[PDB]
Design a protein around this nucleic acid. Structure first.
Ligand SMILES: C[S@@+](CC[C@H](N)C(=O)[O-])C[C@H]1O[C@@H](n2cnc3c(N)ncnc32)[C@H](O)[C@@H]1O
Ligand SMILES: C[S@@+](CC[C@H](N)C(=O)[O-])C[C@H]1O[C@@H](n2cnc3c(N)ncnc32)[C@H](O)[C@@H]1O
Lengths: 487, 30, 390, 390, 487, 30
DNA sequence: CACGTGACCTTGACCTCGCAGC
DNA sequence: CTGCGAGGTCAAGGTCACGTGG
């Protein structure tokens, strides 16, 4: 498709139009502004298809993209229309169907709109000069959008929280190997999610008409809590894109795991990196801990279908790996419930600028119990202490990881020699040894330098203090409760 | 002795806490 | 290997050491000696707590190495168990098992206690894993590898004095975990103590409306039996199969195997009690499943709360577990005595005990995590110590 | 150490060598092997002349060392006896006595025969004397001394095919000594052959004027006896004392001890013959002396020349020495038969035999000296060879 | 005494007078010219003492030194007198044996006389200005004479054959330690001999009337074969000096050894390295060999008195040490008959320019049989490969040798520790091993480069050749004699 | 047999001599 | 006698079996 | 039933000492 051509270049132009504008502070604002315009145009197009089968009105007719975007506005009147009539009209549709959905998506803070009505008009017409009935052009816009999201990922430390490096994604999706049709799930899908990559891949094996409609209807189930990634992501999955994708603003942790009844073949995900949620949410899980990452791990564990070959690629931090207590318990369950067939240690700063925390890719399988685990530590270029905004992670480091993993995958089912999957960088750890370590899944490289790059002790004593004061809080809660309920 | 036990347990806990802020105290330095 | 601060030098451990003697005590058959073997060392604190003094005549074939004050003895058989010790003046000039590697620090270069804390660390033993075999199957290494493994040595030769500083940290640290252990021990007793109040001892008379009752009266029992082995399948045919406690989760049993033709079935909400050693363990059934002879399933009649019975059995568990080999029978279970309050009061107390239990569980997990991170804190202390970062 | 030509390098023997195996033949109990021990080596030519083939089961404890073609085996027990050998292809891959040092030359640096000829020389063994014991009483050295003694390595390393020159030289040289030996053996019988001509065997007829006579008739005998041990003195009191042949020079006896009270005395010109093993040896007596039991003194009577009798006795000596243990008696000596020509003819033949004997003596000494200097010539060949001087 | 300056200088002047003269070619001619003048003056002095004892006729009054030396000659008439009527008169001496001696000394060829009668007269007046009744002046001339002999030793390669380095002498005499009165014997005393040094030592102990006479008459017995060293030596022993010492021009090998008679307490000697003698002389020895050095060794062996403590210091070459055959036999005898308690390896060029042959000092004792032998290798200055005319041997090297030998002498009699006598240049060799080596007494220093500095093969094969055809000659003689004496 | 032996002895001697002048022959060279 | 070969002794290394814990 | 380690066996040298042929 492509044909970026004039079209790609424009879109880039719109971006510099927003750069000039006061109300767009940074690339963040560019991408969300572009997102809401694009989304409205999308909605209008989809309904128009639904005029075609109506032959056999979400909003109308003043407020459809057609009538107000086509018009040649005086700038001031356009700006006044958008803020004065349109956003408000959107804010309040009230139709029990989506239409509520739409507001949920216009529900909060700043809809990003240009300060100069002239700039707004320019960006709007650049957007409506896209042909939505040509998927070449849609493809182009999807590419520009993706690049914008990457640049956003580098510049802004707040995302960060809803972004994940595409090399990581592509790698995880490649190793998980989704087929059509197994549902693909991301219990927290920041923005896009791995779902787009999964889409493109499963699409590369598309084959037949019956299949394509499985891809666009029945294969993408995943979800998001916070509004801005939910919206940006929605726009991304329609952009790449799937005509009407299923993803919900909701909380996955409000759900009660014990009643389950929703399950998927595949889970490719990067849950949050871990703070507290607590209380009432905690009760939705058999193990109870304030830590979000642990609850997400549990949720994922029971979100998988009972059949053999149930897979999950997942991103975890150091914490989930070396921490004991509830983690160990969950980890114990994991190892017995599931076969966890690989871990890839990912160096610090992989996720910078958002965080420099060291992370690991966890690919765990579910035929049965876990016997042995393949560890691949991943090299930084020898120039750098850490991965950075200046030098980020890219697909190559993963080229090597890929080849060695092909080796391990061969050996695991015994179609290949073990020697293929071993390099001083890669080693294989028996499950017994991780159970003597108190379920510490952290990467320890046998053929490597002693230094384990462990935190300064105090940070350790600091966290130790904070959860000790948590313990005190728990005990006085205990004595409050047994002195309360006394007859 | 249910109530008594929590008490003593609690004393033990804030004692432990005392010890580890002595630990933090002497660990910076830094 | 890594960066070094200006003074420090990288030296092979051997380079810092003195030659060390070995002698045969049977050459002095009537002269007593103190013998030290790997069993004589406390792995946790790295001390020799239990030497045995032997007549020179009865000396074991392994008894041939002379220890001396300040010597560090490092066992070569599985040296991940951290049997390593600093030899006290009382043991100076004396034999210890050949299994050990004797490290005599020459004080010109290295202070012995520093070398002790170096060996005590995962550092040198990870050197041992890196070389020799990585994951080959032999438990032991030669003494001279333990003489070739790199160490960082810092001159002066005060810093080894620094370690003197480390001891401070560690003492406080170990002390913390001591308390934690005691806390953990005691914390679990809380639950039983709570239970001790709610369930009266047998033959005491009970608050009004309650009555003693035989379990058989308010509960009906399905003993369970193990099918022929052909029935077992992983293709999910019939019902899941639980033979005994080994299949139990902490609350609900994790099904790993199915029975194509089930004999004795446990419907959900049945209460499962193990009937053979270890006897008395309970777990609740969350799904329809088939039970082996190792299990019995308890199914509570109205007037009985599954959680009332469950908490009761939890209370009774310690000598509900007898210890000729341990088995319990339908009649045995039917004739155990249970207190029976009204159903609503049962559910009230069940709620109360439920929040006590969630609290002590959260508690448990918390202090467990603290313990783990205390181990990690120790490893952090040593890793930070052997670089100039204190 | 040395001074060496441009190509040459000094390297420890060990540096030029290959690691070498040792195996246990009892692991193959029914498999025969050829065993080589120090007794199996000819010291003179440095070859293995007498291996013994042994069943792997009956293998001696010593037999643990495996030899191969080109290996140089150098005995560590008294390695001044030059038990050193070059292993033939027939003995390749084989076991010998641990008392050997196996030298496997790696042909990159050293070709084996040069090393053989190096070890064969007094060079390396003198290195061994410089180290180890100088005078320290123990005959043997460890393998690793024989691996640490300096040697010149002669690259360009087909320069070490100067070994060819050495061997060429050496064989001609060894051949000479062979012939010399033959000469020496043969030269001796000249004397006896001469005597065989002059003295007729008994019962033969004699030239006119001669007559057979019993020695006792023409000679009188003083048997001799050993005094008590107090008489013996080094202060030169009484007369010198000769107990037996041990006191003999080859012509006149050297007095080392005196007898203060002599019993049986021998005047000058008496002829002394040993009467105990070895019987039959004779010396003339040049000074008044006392004789022990081991000796008898013959005084020749007037009809007889002391040298006629003396030469006769030299002739008779081989089975005049018989071989219960052998002793000879006054009567035994008196009844031996002697040819008696006129005194003047006796003195004539005595003169003739005298100059024959002085000639063959001069001869003896000459070829002895040539032999000695052939040994020296060999040592010179090797010393000149191991520096660039050919 | 030593009134060197006034007198010594003149003698040196006389030497430069001869340097100017034509017929004195070199220092050799100087010293012999001086020798014959000095000797005549000596003879005259002794006879004057005998005028004093006549009170209670060697030469005609006309020919006494007095009358012809005192008068002032026209030079030509002096020269004409000396050649025409004096020297032939001195060959004109027929009489008691001693005059035979005087005749004997002159009778051998060509006394050194100056070509210029003026120079001759000058030298004669310098000689005649010496006071023979002052032991001071005699002492001075003796010193100058000794220095002249040393310089002669360095310059002339033929002497050489009758000279030995004074450091060697003094060392040997010091180790032998002669007492009064045991006779001192040099069976070949080249010139002076060790006898002057022995004299000076034994004299440093006299300290009583009886002793002096013993010294002057009965303690010096030794002998010389060749006329020029015999004469020069006579002059030297009178110079130092003993009034009229007994030593004879004769052949030492003249004498038969079985007869022996003789004999002496001490032998300090340096017999010739020596070459063949052969024939008639050979019969004088029990072992018969053409080699002069070996016969000298035998002679010395039987020349010693039978008493315990019979000593000999002696100089031998390599040949006597490493050669086998007759040598071994003699050597055997030595080792059995005698205790040879030390050997000092003397580096090549010690005697240069005469030889450069490696030599050894042999101190052998006669209590009894030989058990242990002390070996001292002697160092060259490490600058030098060999000792030379330019750099000769001096007393210092021997000083170190001295201290170590004191150590060995202490240990031998068990008055001291062995550790004293050992140094890397000192080692002790047990007799068994020298008998295993076929009586090779050559120095092998364990603690030294293995190199033994053997001569190149060719020289070995050469000597081997000449004595092989010697063997052929011997056999030719054998068979000639065996068919010659056939009846 | 006395005379013959010296003869033969003499032969061994001139042979030995020959061997050793071939020895000197090939020894310089040197 | 003193030279070597068989024996005994030591060092260092691997095998594995009795024993107490999960 | 599995992991730990102390007793045992084993291999590589190294020193000791006795039989024995010249
Ligand atoms: C690291 S991101 C996921 C990245 C995403 N897979 C991607 O790279 O495209 C974590 C995301 O999960 C979302 N999230 C956090 N808590 C959540 C919850 N309780 N339920 C659903 N989503 C949640 C956050 O908004 C954040 O965007
Ligand atoms: C090397 S010198 C001895 C050196 C002498 N000791 C000295 O003080 O110079 C040998 C001397 O012995 C003399 N000589 C050689 N053959 C002799 C013999 N057959 N009898 C006596 N003297 C002899 C030689 O003339 C020579 O002067």
């Amino acid at each position: 498709p492509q044909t970026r051509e004039s079209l790609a270049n424009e879109i880039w132009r719109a971006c510099d139009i927003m750069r000039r504008d006061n109300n767009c502070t940074g690339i963040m604002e560019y991408v969300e502004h572009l997102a809401w315009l694009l989304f409205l145009r999308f909605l209008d197009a989809q309904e128009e298809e639904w005029e075609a089968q109506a032959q056999i009105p979400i909003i109308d007719s003043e407020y459809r993209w057609r009538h107000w975007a086509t018009k040649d506005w005086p700038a001031d009147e356009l700006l006044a229309f958008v803020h004065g009539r349109l956003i408000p009209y959107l804010r309040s549709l009230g139709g029990d169907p989506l239409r509520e959905t739409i507001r949920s998506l216009f529900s909060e803070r700043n809809v990003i709109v240009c300060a100069s009505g002239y700039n707004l008009k320019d960006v709007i017409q650049i957007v409506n000069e896209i042909n939505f009935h040509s998927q070449d052009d849609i493809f182009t816009v999807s590419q520009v959008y993706e690049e914008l999201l990457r640049r956003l990922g580098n510049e802004n430390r707040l995302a960060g929280e809803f972004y994940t490096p595409r090399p990581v994604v592509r790698f995880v999706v490649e190793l998980v190997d989704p087929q059509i049709g197994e549902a693909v799930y991301d219990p927290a899908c920041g923005t896009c999610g791995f779902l787009v990559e999964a889409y493109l891949w499963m699409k590369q094996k598309e084959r037949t008409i019956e299949d394509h409609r499985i891809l666009q209807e029945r294969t993408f189930f995943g979800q998001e809590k916070k509004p801005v990634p939910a919206f940006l992501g929605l726009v991304n999955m329609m952009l790449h894109g799937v005509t009407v994708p299923r993803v919900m603003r909701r909380n996955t942790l409000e759900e009660n795991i014990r009643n389950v009844s929703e399950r998927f073949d595949v889970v490719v995900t990067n849950p949050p990196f871990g703070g507290t949620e607590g209380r009432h949410i905690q009760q939705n899980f058999p193990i109870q801990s304030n830590a979000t990452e642990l609850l997400f791990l549990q949720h994922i564990m029971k979100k998988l279908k009972p059949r053999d070959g149930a897979r999950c690629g997942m991103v975890v931090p150091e914490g989930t790996l070396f921490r004991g207590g509830a983690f160990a318990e969950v980890k114990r369950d994991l190892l017995e419930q599931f076969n966890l067939h690989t871990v890839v240690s990912l160096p610090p700063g992989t996720f910078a600028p958002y965080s420099d925390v060291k992370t690991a890719l966890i690919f765990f399988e579910r035929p049965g119990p876990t016997k042995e685990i393949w560890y691949y530590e991943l090299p930084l270029p020898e120039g750098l202490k850490k991965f950075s905004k200046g030098n980020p992670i890219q697909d190559e480091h993963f080229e090597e990881a890929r080849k060695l993993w092909r080796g391990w995958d061969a050996y695991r089912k015994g179609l290949g020699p073990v020697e293929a999957c071993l390099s001083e960088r890669s080693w294989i750890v028996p499950v017994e040894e991780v159970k003597k370590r108190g379920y510490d899944l952290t990467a320890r490289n046998p053929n490597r330098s002693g230094g384990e790059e462990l935190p300064s002790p105090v940070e350790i004593v600091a966290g130790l203090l904070e959860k000790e004061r948590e313990i005190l809080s728990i005990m006085e809660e205990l004595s409050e409760l047994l002195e309360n309920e006394k007859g | 002795s249910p109530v008594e036990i929590v008490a003593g347990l609690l004393e033990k806990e804030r004692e432990i806490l005392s010890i580890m802020e002595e630990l933090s105290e002497l660990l910076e330095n830094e | 290997p890594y960066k070094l601060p200006p003074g420090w030098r990288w030296v092979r451990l051997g380079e810092v050491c003195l030659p060390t003697e070995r002698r045969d005590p049977t050459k002095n058959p009537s002269t007593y000696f103190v013998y030290v073997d790997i069993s004589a060392i406390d792995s946790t604190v790295g001390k020799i707590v239990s030497p045995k003094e032997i007549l020179g005549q009865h000396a074991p074939s392994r008894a041939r190495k002379v220890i001396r004050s300040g010597d560090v003895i490092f066992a070569t058989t599985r040296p991940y168990l951290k049997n390593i010790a600093l030899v006290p003046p009382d043991l100076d000039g004396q034999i210890c098992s050949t299994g050990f590697c004797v490290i005599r620090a020459n004080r010109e270069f290295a202070e012995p206690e520093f070398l002790f804390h170096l060996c005590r660390s995962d550092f040198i033993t990870n050197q041992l894993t890196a070389s020799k075999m990585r994951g080959t199957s032999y438990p032991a290494v030669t003494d001279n590898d333990v003489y070739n493994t790199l160490i960082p040595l810092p001159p002066l030769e005060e810093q080894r004095r620094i370690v003197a500083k480390v001891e401070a940290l560690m003492e406080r640290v170990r002390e913390v975990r001591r308390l934690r252990a005691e806390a953990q021990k005691d914390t679990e007793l809380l639950m039983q103590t709570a239970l001790a109040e709610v369930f009266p001892h047998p033959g005491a008379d009970l608050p009004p409306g309650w009555r003693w009752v035989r379990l058989g009266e308010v509960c009906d029992i399905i003993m369970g039996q193990s099918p022929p082995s052909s029935t077992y399948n992983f293709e999910g045919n019939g019902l899941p199969f639980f033979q005994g406690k080994a299949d139990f989760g902490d609350l609900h049993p994790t099904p790993r195997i199915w029975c194509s033709a089930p004999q004795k079935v446990a419907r959900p909400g049945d209460v499962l009690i193990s009937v053979r050693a270890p006897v008395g363990s309970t777990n609740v059934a969350n799904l329809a499943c088939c039970i082996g002879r190792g299990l019995a399933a308890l199914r509570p009649r109205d007037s009985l709360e599954r959680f009332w019975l469950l908490y009761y059995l939890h209370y009774l568990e310690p000598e509900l577990s007898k210890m000729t080999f341990n088995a319990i029978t339908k009649k045995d279970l039917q004739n155990v005595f249970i207190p029976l309050p009204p159903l609503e009061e049962q559910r009230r107390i069940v709620a109360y005990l439920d929040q006590i239990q969630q609290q002590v569980a959260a508690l448990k997990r918390a202090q467990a995590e603290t313990e783990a991170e205390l181990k990690r804190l120790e490893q952090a202390i040593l890793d930070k110590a052997f670089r100039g970062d204190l």
